[PDB]
Amino acid sequence: PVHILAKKGEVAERVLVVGDPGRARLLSTLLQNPKLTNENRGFLVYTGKYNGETVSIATHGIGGPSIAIVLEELAMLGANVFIRYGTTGALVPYINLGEYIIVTGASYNQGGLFYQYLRDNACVASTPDFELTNKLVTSFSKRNLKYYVGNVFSSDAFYAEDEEFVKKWSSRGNIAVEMECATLFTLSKVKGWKSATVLVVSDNLAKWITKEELEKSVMDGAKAVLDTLTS
Amino acid sequence: PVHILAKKGEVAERVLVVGDPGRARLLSTLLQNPKLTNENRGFLVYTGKYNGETVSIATHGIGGPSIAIVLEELAMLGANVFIRYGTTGALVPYINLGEYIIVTGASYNQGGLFYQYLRDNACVASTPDFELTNKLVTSFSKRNLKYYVGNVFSSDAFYAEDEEFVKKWSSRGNIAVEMECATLFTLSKVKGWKSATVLVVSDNLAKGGIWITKEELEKSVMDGAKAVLDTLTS
Amino acid sequence: PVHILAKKGEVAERVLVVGDPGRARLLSTLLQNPKLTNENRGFLVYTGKYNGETVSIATHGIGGPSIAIVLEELAMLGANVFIRYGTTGALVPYINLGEYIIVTGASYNQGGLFYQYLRDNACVASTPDFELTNKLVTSFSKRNLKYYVGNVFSSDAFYAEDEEFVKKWSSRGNIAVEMECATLFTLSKVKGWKSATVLVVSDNLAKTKEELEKSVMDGAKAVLDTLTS
Amino acid sequence: PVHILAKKGEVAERVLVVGDPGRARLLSTLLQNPKLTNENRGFLVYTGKYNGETVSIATHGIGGPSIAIVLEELAMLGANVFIRYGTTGALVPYINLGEYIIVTGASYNQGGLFYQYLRDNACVASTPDFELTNKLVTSFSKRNLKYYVGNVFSSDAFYAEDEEFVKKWSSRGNIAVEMECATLFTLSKVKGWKSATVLVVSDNLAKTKEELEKSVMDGAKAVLDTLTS
Amino acid sequence: PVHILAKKGEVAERVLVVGDPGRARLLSTLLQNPKLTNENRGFLVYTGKYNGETVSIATHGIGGPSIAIVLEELAMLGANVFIRYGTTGALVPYINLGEYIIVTGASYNQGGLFYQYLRDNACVASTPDFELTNKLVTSFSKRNLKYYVGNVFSSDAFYAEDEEFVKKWSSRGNIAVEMECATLFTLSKVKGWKSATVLVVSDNLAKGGIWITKEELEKSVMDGAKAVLDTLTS
Amino acid sequence: PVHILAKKGEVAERVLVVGDPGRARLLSTLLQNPKLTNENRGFLVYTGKYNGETVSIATHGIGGPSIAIVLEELAMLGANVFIRYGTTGALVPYINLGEYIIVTGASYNQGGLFYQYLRDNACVASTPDFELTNKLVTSFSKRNLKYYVGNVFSSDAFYAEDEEFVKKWSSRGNIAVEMECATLFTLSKVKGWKSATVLVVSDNLAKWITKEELEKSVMDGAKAVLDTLTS
């Protein structure tokens, strides 16, 4: 590896990946005896225990290219189970802020990364591991957390303009929008890794919350994700 | 509806769709008082009772263009829950004939039908209804049937040649190949229908030697059908 | 062949293909001593004689994927000449219902089937066999049938929406729309089969049952003449 | 028109188009009282009579972009019937140098010109006018000229490398390769022009100057007959 | 070489390529002892002296397919430095007729010629030789000629209709439109040739009212030509 | 903005963007009175003076999606001149480690980000600002720095496998490989920003160096870039 400078044995098999470095650190406090195993290029990687199991919490930055690089290196260091945990903008009105979304599939625009990996333009099903996603569902319900199940659209251009964004993607079976799921799912399915994703709705593009309520929402969801990784 | 000619209220909200009209007829015998509600253009459709619940079994033919037409007209006639039941060929050497595959997504080569519907080449997630697929899983394990869970590649060219067919598709997360799932899944997400699929392994491209007998297969078809009908009428 | 379970030699070298099983059975009435050589998966195939030639009438269902499968297996059974006969919707106001359209080429949207067969996205000329199409012209000319010669658009999504459908495809040199010609022609070109197509206009997207019936039947006779021409 | 500076009415309604300026001048010798109606940018255009009809002979240079520009402006000048006459390389071993190929369709690779005109990537049927191609058949038949009927591949890169060129395009139903047919046909279909094409085989990619010359000239006479048919 | 029929050593290493054969002839008069080295298929090629240095002026016709053929045969005959000189239409309202545009890159709709050469649809950087373009800049400012520097869109369809043509291409960093630069630039990078381009604004699509006189333009053509020839022979 | 939390007036018009947060900080010492104006999501943004001018040094992370987001927000805060400064792998043998590459164009694979921004698949010329790139050249030469001028290929999948990588991209006019230039150039040309790029060769895929020599190389190049931004 060349971005994640941790050494083999400092990265657990089970990994909770987040886009923000500040969140990884913040969430590292939910672990027993948290240890910073990397900080190169800003990709903070924490390792510790939870429910008598070794778990890592890594940063993947923003975008397909970035997370693809982080997954590849975490895997080279032993990781083979990934659960992305982030925030997202909902594409449907009936979903409120602070509630969660367990991802079942990712729509995406063809090209770049996908072309380079898939070697052609075929639309390979971009889905998470079935077992692991069901385990996520069981966890969130066990903790009485309000969650919705559906596909998301993984966008590459946050600021690109599209006058029909919400209608287009919502009418295409997508209930929210983020940026890494398509790369995570497809890359996982190719490399043989088990992956899933849970998102915190921080905005509704089709229809508010305090910073406290949100972090509380992020915290509750994290315990559910961490439970699943060690279940 | 110009292909399926059924009157008002002949098609049920829940529908088991198969490609073979013969299988549709054969499976209609598991229902109570099965009545033929359409036979136009060869698309046999039966409506009957199962566990005291009303369901329909319809023929969709082969290929996306065909199943799209059948699904669109069926929904027009009142259907909104579809469970495709058909045959497939495994792409992994660890799956035996007669066993079942519960579809979790569908890969596909874009263009054709998708372009006309999506108005562009975006790769929209082609997945089945999450809940419904779980019901099928519960149903199949409750009837102690051996099944695997994963994605399938929906081919449009049965006889097209590809020297790397198996390694390509199985390395892309697909454990089997069939021809209708991508269209069913994607079309469903757009129109708002609840769909899912269960396939019976009739061949294995990762081992083209083993084989199944007429009765062994048909027995394997009947078994799965009951599980599927339990789900549709649960 | 896993779909068309006809015996080898039980399928004529010359075949008239139609999308609906009902029509294949109805048109078999035009053969001498018609025999059902297959009924698997609803794909009815009848084999008999017309004039001094053995001829088959096969069903291909709806859609490129369906007709490709049928074409492939009929060939493995000895078929090398195919003439598709079906219904279609005109894209121009000057063609009346019941009139015929002799197909000269097919427009299509880049697709999986073409990609799987062609291996890339080239726009290969999707045309019928030149001689066969001219013989059809001669045949429909002899029986004094009103026909128009032109290209059609092979749609893959019957119910897909497009507010400019008629204008877009008619200004692109297409006078009608159906669903199997592009697959037929192109596959035929790559495989070496001689193929052609004549359609009966059952609708005009720009503008009686006996009206059609007789139209269908008369057309079939004209086609069978050509097949045994 | 900024390229073909011919006066309106100085271009016949029927036009024979060739890629090389030398040939257009050489074939004008076949017209009655030939007049040079344009020579701008090297695009020589001659107008005269053949039989009882006014006919023009225009140059289009090499490549889709070039012939589209010429076709567009000739039309703005009154042309609606175009017959391209050029050289070509066979993709099959059974066609001899000097023999002719009457074009039935053109295969092409998705491109800018097609995209700019069609507005999307659909594979629109790129074929000649059915009647015009049959008249050419009749004409080359009367003058007893050996011709073959089929599709060609319109390449955009003469020197682009492809170790499987011959096999790829010949197994896709193409018996020859040239560079302007696809543009001609498709543009003609969208614009409403009647177009056709006959090529003289000057090379075989699978297998005397007077040999060709006479071949060229004889072909031109056959084409002019058709143009004034 | 089947299009350009010149003997051994008739084409010079440095070459000024124009699309119009007439302009090629007209510009050959600025050379010393200009000799016609080819006229086959209308592609006039002249070889002569400028500032005691040997250069050639060749015709390439209209469009990428055409210029590709001419460039490939010329290089075969010994050429390896190309400077295209032609006309263009501005896409910005601040550029007047008779002024010049020194090309820094070329936009294009993929497919056709590019696919056959690149073997796929990657968008390879279509740029001119950096050094050579700077020489042209020095040359033009040294002759006090008004010029702008930027990218151009290489169209394959002169008469294709587009209701948003100008705003689309000018909003994408293109200050003009022509038909050959993309092919020249991209082909050059692949074969290893040194290329560049200078265009004379003969029209402005952001203001289709103003206009230039025959002599005013030809004078503007001759002026730029000298600057270009200084560069090729420097 | 939502990623770069700096306030309007804390981001200069002139900006030196780098992929690594640690480099931005390291390079901030070349400024007069450096001030950290943002650290949200790990995108460190420093502002200070150089040659009597206000300059910012920002982090853009890895990948088109990431840098596109950072440019968009820096611009919303006043930035309109960007010079990317990073490391790269050379595609040609004659270039040695530690030497520099002034970028004149970026090749890229179609799709994603480009499709979303350009609204179609056209290959828009992805080039830097002509003036600014020449000024970069003048700077590097004024400091006797060994540099090469050419196009680079902006890859989206660092770990994607391609057996013909080097031959393919080198024979296509590219002398090096990185990941952000195509997005930077094209996005700049559309938004009206003036951009350029200079790269440090840290590897040669077609044919070594110490960490000291490299940082020394990174430092020398930075002074040249900073000179250009204030020239």
Residues 6+ apart with CB under 8 A from E121: E110, E111, E114, E115, F110, F121
Residue with the two structure tokens 């009749």: D138
Task: Quote the CA–CA distance of B23 and A231 in Å, as a whole number.
Answer: 42
Task: Please name which of B126, B169, B154 lies closest in space to residue B64, comparing C-alpha atoms.
Answer: B154
Q: Nearest residue on chain C to D131, judged by CA atoms?
A: C149
**Chain A touched by B172 (CB under 8 Å):** yes
Q: Provide the token pair at E188.
A: 């050059």
Confirm if C38 and C5 have CB atoms less than 8 A apart.
Answer: yes
Burial of B94 (0-12, 13-18, 19+ CB in 10 A): exposed
Confirm if F16 and F58 have CB atoms less than 8 A apart.
Answer: yes
The answer to whether the CB atoms of A123 and B127 lie below 8 A apart is: no
Task: Please name which of E84, E23, E20 lies closest in space to residue E231, comparing C-alpha atoms.
Answer: E84
- The full length of chain A comes to 231
Residue with the two structure tokens 């749609």: C155
Confirm if C106 and C222 have CB atoms less than 8 A apart.
Answer: no
Task: Quote the CA–CA distance of E76 and D69 in Å, as a whole number.
Answer: 28
Confirm if E103 and E201 have CB atoms less than 8 A apart.
Answer: no
Q: Which of E44, E62, E108 sits opposite D69 (nearest CB)?
A: E62
The answer to whether the CB atoms of C127 and D104 lie below 8 A apart is: yes
Residue-wise over B112-140: b if at least 16 C-beta within 10 A, else e?
bbbbbbbeebbbbbbbbbbebbbbbbebb
What is the fold, at CATH topology level, of the domain defined by F1-231?
Rossmann fold (3.40.50)
Task: Quote the CA–CA distance of C229 and C55 in Å, as a whole number.
Answer: 12
Task: Quote the CA–CA distance of F133 and F129 in Å, as a whole number.
Answer: 6
Resolution (angstroms) stands at 2.5
Confirm or deny that C60 is annotated as ligand binding. no
Confirm or deny that C54 is annotated as ligand binding. no
Q: Which of D108, D125, D182 sits opposite C106 (nearest CB)?
A: D125
Angle of the A64-76 helix axis to the A181-191 helix axis, nearest 10: 30
Task: Quote the CA–CA distance of C6 and C11 in Å, as a whole number.
Answer: 7
Residue with the two structure tokens 């058949």: D137
Task: Quote the CA–CA distance of C103 and C126 in Å, as a whole number.
Answer: 11
Residues 6+ apart with CB under 8 A from F210: none
**Backbone Cα Rg of chain F:** 17
Known binding-site residues of F equal: 3, 19, 23, 41, 84-87, 161, 178-180, 202-203
Determine the Cα angle at C175 with ends C171 and C177, to 5°. Answer: 105
Q: Pairing mode, if any, of strands C14-18 and C81-90?
A: parallel
Separation in Å, CA C137 to CA B188, C51, C148: 43, 19, 9
Task: Please name which of E132, E79, E76, E72 lies closest in space to residue E102, comparing C-alpha atoms.
Answer: E132
Confirm if E83 and E173 have CB atoms less than 8 A apart.
Answer: no
Compute the Cα dihedral for B156, B160, B162, B163 and give only its sign.
positive
Among the CATH numbers 3.90.230.10, 3.30.1330.30, 3.40.50.300, 3.40.50.1580, which is that of B1-234? 3.40.50.1580
Determine the Cα angle at B122 with ends B120 and B124, to 5°. Answer: 120
Compute the Cα dihedral for B222, B225, B229, B230 and give only its sign.
positive
Task: Tell me which chains share at least 3 CB pairs under 8 Å with chain B.
Answer: A, C
Burial of D85 (0-12, 13-18, 19+ CB in 10 A): buried
Identity at A96, one-letter amino acid code: N
The answer to whether the CB atoms of C171 and D150 lie below 8 A apart is: no
The DSSP 8-state label assigned to residue B204 in this structure reads E
Confirm if D214 and D188 have CB atoms less than 8 A apart.
Answer: no
Q: Which of F22, F115, F155 sits opposite A116 (nearest CB)?
A: F155
Neighbour count for residue B203 (Cβ, 10 Å): 17
Residues 6+ apart with CB under 8 A from C145: C100, C218, C219, C222
Determine the Cα angle at E156 with ends E151 and E159, to 5°. Answer: 110
Known binding-site residues of E for phosphate equal: 19, 23, 41, 84-87
Q: How many CA atoms lie within 13 A of E223 on its CB side?
A: 19
The DSSP 8-state label assigned to residue E123 in this structure reads B
Query: Domain-by-domain residue ranges, chain A?
Result: 1-231
Identity at D162, one-letter amino acid code: D
Q: Nearest residue on chain B to C202, judged by CA atoms?
A: B2
| Helix H or strand E segment including B191 | helix B181-191
Q: How many CA atoms lie within 13 A of D178 on its CB side?
A: 32
Task: Quote the CA–CA distance of E121 and E111 in Å, as a whole number.
Answer: 7
Chain F residues whose CB is inside 8 A of the A19 CB are: 41
What are φ and ψ of residue C84, in 5° steps? -85, 135
The answer to whether the CB atoms of C172 and D121 lie below 8 A apart is: no
Task: Quote the CA–CA distance of C56 and C6 in Å, as a whole number.
Answer: 11
What are φ and ψ of residue B138, in 5° steps? -60, -45
Residue D2 CA, distance from chain mean position: 22
The answer to whether the CB atoms of F123 and E134 lie below 8 A apart is: no
The answer to whether the CB atoms of E109 and F122 lie below 8 A apart is: yes
The answer to whether the CB atoms of B61 and C64 lie below 8 A apart is: no
Confirm if C11 and C45 have CB atoms less than 8 A apart.
Answer: yes
Q: What is the dihedral of CA E220, E223, E226, E229, to 10 degrees?
A: -30
Distance in Å, alpha carbon of E20 to nearest chain F alpha carbon:
26
Q: Provide the token pair at B119.
A: 């108005």
Beta strands in E67-193 (DSSP E): 81-90, 100-107, 147-154, 174-178
Residues 6+ apart with CB under 8 A from D141: D147
Chain F residues whose CB is inside 8 A of the E151 CB are: 125, 127, 189
The SS3 call for residue C220 is helix
* β partners of residue E17: E58, E84
Q: Does D1-229 carry CATH code 3.30.1360.200? A: no
Task: Quote the CA–CA distance of A113 and C201 in Å, as a whole number.
Answer: 47
**Chain F touched by E121 (CB under 8 Å):** yes
The SS3 call for residue E82 is strand
Task: Quote the CA–CA distance of C126 and D123 in Å, as a whole number.
Answer: 9
Task: Quote the CA–CA distance of E55 and E46 in Å, as a whole number.
Answer: 8
Task: Please name which of A161, B205, D156 lies closest in space to residue F116, comparing C-alpha atoms.
Answer: A161
Residue with the two structure tokens 């099928």: B136
Q: How many contiguous H segments (helices) and E segments (strands) does chain B have?
A: 7, 9
**Chain C touched by D140 (CB under 8 Å):** no
Confirm or deny that A172 is annotated as ligand binding. no
DSSP string, A70-82: HHHHHHHTT--EE
Confirm if C123 and D108 have CB atoms less than 8 A apart.
Answer: yes
Neighbour count for residue B210 (Cβ, 10 Å): 9
Residue with the two structure tokens 């023929």: B59
Compute the Cα dihedral for B109, B110, B116, B117 and give only its sign.
positive
The DSSP 8-state label assigned to residue B173 in this structure reads T
DSSP string, chain A: --S----TTSS-SEEEEES-HHHHHHHGGGSEEEEEEE-GGG--EEEEESSSSEEEEEE--SSHHHHHHHHHHHHHTT--EEEEEEEEEESSTT--TT-EEEEEEEEE--BHHHHHHHSS--B------HHHHHHHHHHHHHTT--EEEEEEEE-S-TT---TTHHHHHHTTTEEEEESSHHHHHHHHHHHT-EEEEEEEEEEETT----HHHHHHHHHHHHHHHHHHHT-
Task: Please name which of F50, F71, F64, F63 lies closest in space to residue F4, comparing C-alpha atoms.
Answer: F71
